[PDB]
Design an enzyme around this catalytic site. Sequence first.
Site, mmCIF file in Angstrom:
data_model
loop_
_atom_site.group_PDB
_atom_site.id
_atom_site.type_symbol
_atom_site.label_atom_id
_atom_site.label_comp_id
_atom_site.label_asym_id
_atom_site.label_seq_id
_atom_site.Cartn_x
_atom_site.Cartn_y
_atom_site.Cartn_z
ATOM 1 N N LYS B 53 0.818 -1.195 0.000
ATOM 2 C CA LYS B 53 0.000 0.000 0.000
ATOM 3 C C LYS B 53 0.864 1.261 0.000
ATOM 4 O O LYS B 53 0.528 2.229 -0.682
ATOM 5 C CB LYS B 53 -0.992 -0.043 1.167
ATOM 6 C CG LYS B 53 -2.108 -1.062 0.994
ATOM 7 C CD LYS B 53 -2.918 -1.368 2.268
ATOM 8 C CE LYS B 53 -3.669 -2.668 2.050
ATOM 9 N NZ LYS B 53 -4.468 -3.091 3.230
ATOM 10 N N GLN B 97 -5.293 -1.724 9.033
ATOM 11 C CA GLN B 97 -4.978 -2.989 8.391
ATOM 12 C C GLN B 97 -5.720 -4.102 9.139
ATOM 13 O O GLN B 97 -5.702 -4.103 10.369
ATOM 14 C CB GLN B 97 -3.464 -3.230 8.501
ATOM 15 C CG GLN B 97 -3.017 -4.541 7.857
ATOM 16 C CD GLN B 97 -3.436 -4.437 6.403
ATOM 17 O OE1 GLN B 97 -3.195 -3.412 5.767
ATOM 18 N NE2 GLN B 97 -4.071 -5.469 5.853
ATOM 19 N N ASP B 120 -11.273 2.003 2.820
ATOM 20 C CA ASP B 120 -11.615 0.592 2.712
ATOM 21 C C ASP B 120 -13.116 0.381 2.471
ATOM 22 O O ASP B 120 -13.543 -0.713 2.123
ATOM 23 C CB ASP B 120 -11.132 -0.190 3.939
ATOM 24 C CG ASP B 120 -9.797 -0.871 3.682
ATOM 25 O OD1 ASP B 120 -9.550 -1.294 2.507
ATOM 26 O OD2 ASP B 120 -9.018 -0.984 4.638
HETATM 27 O O1 LIG Z 1 0.466 -9.949 -6.181
HETATM 28 C C1 LIG Z 1 -0.411 -10.421 -5.441
HETATM 29 O O2 LIG Z 1 -0.995 -11.501 -5.665
HETATM 30 C C2 LIG Z 1 -0.843 -9.590 -4.301
HETATM 31 C C3 LIG Z 1 -0.562 -8.202 -4.343
HETATM 32 C C4 LIG Z 1 -0.954 -7.344 -3.297
HETATM 33 C C5 LIG Z 1 -1.679 -7.895 -2.210
HETATM 34 C C6 LIG Z 1 -2.152 -7.042 -1.112
HETATM 35 O O3 LIG Z 1 -1.414 -6.173 -0.610
HETATM 36 N N1 LIG Z 1 -3.445 -7.193 -0.726
HETATM 37 C C7 LIG Z 1 -4.461 -8.101 -1.305
HETATM 38 C C8 LIG Z 1 -4.888 -9.108 -0.237
HETATM 39 C C9 LIG Z 1 -5.021 -8.428 1.131
HETATM 40 C C10 LIG Z 1 -4.613 -7.153 1.377
HETATM 41 C C11 LIG Z 1 -4.798 -6.518 2.674
HETATM 42 O O4 LIG Z 1 -4.422 -5.380 2.876
HETATM 43 O O5 LIG Z 1 -5.403 -7.268 3.658
HETATM 44 C C12 LIG Z 1 -5.821 -8.556 3.458
HETATM 45 C C13 LIG Z 1 -6.429 -9.202 4.541
HETATM 46 C C14 LIG Z 1 -6.863 -10.513 4.353
HETATM 47 C C15 LIG Z 1 -6.732 -11.152 3.107
HETATM 48 C C16 LIG Z 1 -6.118 -10.509 2.004
HETATM 49 C C17 LIG Z 1 -5.671 -9.186 2.203
HETATM 50 C C18 LIG Z 1 -3.924 -6.302 0.374
HETATM 51 C C19 LIG Z 1 -1.987 -9.265 -2.177
HETATM 52 C C20 LIG Z 1 -1.599 -10.142 -3.228
#
Ligand SMILES: O=C(O)c1ccc(C(=O)N2CCc3c(c(=O)oc4ccccc34)C2)cc1
Lengths: 294, 293
Positions: B53, B97, B120
């Site tokens: 992020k 987060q 969000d």
């Molecule tokens: O290249 C990729 O495959 C890939 C790139 C980036 C992200 C990422 O940063 N995510 C997505 C999932 C996620 C995020 C989150 O902030 O909280 C989560 C809380 C629970 C479950 C999944 C998230 C943010 C993820 C995968």
Amino acid sequence: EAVVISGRKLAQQIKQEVRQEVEEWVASGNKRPHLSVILVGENPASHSYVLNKTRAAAVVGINSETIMKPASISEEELLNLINKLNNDDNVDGLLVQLPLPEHIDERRICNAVSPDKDVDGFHVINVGRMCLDQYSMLPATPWGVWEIIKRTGIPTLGKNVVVAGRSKNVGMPIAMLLHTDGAHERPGGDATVTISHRYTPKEQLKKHTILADIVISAAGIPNLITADMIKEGAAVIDVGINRVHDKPKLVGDVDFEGVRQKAGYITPVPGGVGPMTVAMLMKNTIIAAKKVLR
Amino acid sequence: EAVVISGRKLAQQIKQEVRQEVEEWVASGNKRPHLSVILVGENPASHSYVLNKTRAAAVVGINSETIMKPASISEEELLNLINKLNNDDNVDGLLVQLPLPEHIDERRICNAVSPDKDVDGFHVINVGRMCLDQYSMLPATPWGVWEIIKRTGIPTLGKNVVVAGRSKNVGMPIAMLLHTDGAHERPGGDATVTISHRYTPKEQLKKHTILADIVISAAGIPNLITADMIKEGAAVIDVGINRVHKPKLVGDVDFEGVRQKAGYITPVPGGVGPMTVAMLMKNTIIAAKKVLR
Ligand SMILES: O=C(O)c1ccc(C(=O)N2CCc3c(c(=O)oc4ccccc34)C2)cc1
Ligand SMILES: O=C(O)c1ccc(C(=O)N2CCc3c(c(=O)oc4ccccc34)C2)cc1
Ligand SMILES: O=C(O)c1ccc(C(=O)N2CCc3c(c(=O)oc4ccccc34)C2)cc1
Ligand SMILES: O=C(O)c1ccc(C(=O)N2CCc3c(c(=O)oc4ccccc34)C2)cc1
């Protein structure tokens, strides 16, 4: 043939629960619940719906008043009226009968009703709460459909359910209650739910309904559901309210006569979901009076 | 066999739009947008997501700050920090987060974040607004799924769509976006949507997937979608983020199997994830512009 579920009888039962809950509430020394209904203009069906709500309140020991204003009312007057009622500590439940005239912003009116008096559950915060499976004032048609299903003892967990229609106070809320987690603060039915609507192709609905243990139809289209669409044994909940003429009449969404043969359970129109909607509003009004939620 | 959709590439594209949009906003005389992230504890996934992020923000010209708190923080302490950031006029977007420690109530935290900073889109008013098809801060993962579909030109109106998973910030809003009216304030997909979850029986998921023009999986279950579940030519969108084994990362689809049958597919890594992070940038410039105030 299919067990015809009696909306009248179930609504009668719920009405008795509420009458008992209100009496105990009052016996414990609390104020008798009051329900206020704002009715705008002169839609005949609205006018009769509000009478159905006033009768039901009277029978369950809940006080009511319908405040009828003319179609000509300005949105801002309506807001004033709602603001008055919101502030009157004697009103526990407030609702605004729909549809409103084209010149009034429905959503603005629905959000002016205090969430705590929102016995229709159409306020954005109650819609949000409902969609997060939290405690909320549930909208009454969805809650009625739910009760018909649970009270009749038809299973939902793991089962397959189709909901025809996606309106925000009927179809979407039904789909929300049916598919969500039995374990959440406001339990749902853990079914596998398909939402269909006016852009479903005829064939696509059929391919879905034929798979469905429960078909809930809330589309407002006479004969949308025919017997070839349903699988033998399945529950058909008919949420449609269609005024046709022949003798002006009230018909459902389902072909009642036909599907009767195929379905394990069915609900009539009239006398089906309708009475239940009205009864659940009475549940919501005592909830409101008790100030459980806030 | 399947056109693989690069969510990485589409996300870089979207970030380029955002960068231009931010450049324009600032050059017009406005304050540069600032995003604050609150990160509690030490989940290593969480830490990496916050890294993603902060990098995305840097790329698009948005100011960031992560405020890291120990897992030991109390709910009330968390609310004070959130209350602080809500009031700091310099902070345009604010996200906490997830997941949070068990002694902190997620819903209560999510509702503490000011709806106008809620990039969000998890505040109850934003959920409510979305569920009524009104303009809202859309949650990033569903909006990103929507974007994959729309920019790839995959039609939705009239089509069958299965969404496996019904979580409140992923599966449920995806189902909400896809089934709703194209004519409403916030357009939806006009698709015919089936929601399944942990109690859909395997035979029952399959009986529905097979009719699907689009299958969208948000279950967190490896190999939940296999090629015999999928109708030939269908779009398969993999929302899954599953840590398997060096420590590996897979989706919910059997990519290798499924790609041989589907008409489009998204990989993990590199599919939905980057889109999620991209849409969060779009929400931040939206928040900074105070469009929905
Ligand atoms: O290249 C990729 O495959 C890939 C790139 C980036 C992200 C990422 O940063 N995510 C997505 C999932 C996620 C995020 C989150 O902030 O909280 C989560 C809380 C629970 C479950 C999944 C998230 C943010 C993820 C995968
Ligand atoms: O003119 C025909 O020959 C024709 C008749 C009926 C269908 C049909 O079955 N539809 C269309 C409308 C509809 C459906 C639905 O599932 O839910 C709805 C919920 C609300 C409103 C309309 C629907 C599915 C298709 C074509
Ligand atoms: O025996 C019966 O079939 C029957 C009993 C009672 C009612 C009733 O009063 N309803 C249900 C429908 C409805 C109500 C409303 O208040 O507004 C509506 C606004 C739009 C559409 C339908 C309603 C309230 C209806 C039918
Ligand atoms: O070998 C087996 O024992 C077996 C494997 C998988 C299934 C299956 O297909 N499931 C269950 C989990 C699940 C489903 C779903 O549709 O969405 C979910 C969304 C979130 C979490 C779990 C699900 C459907 C059934 C049996």
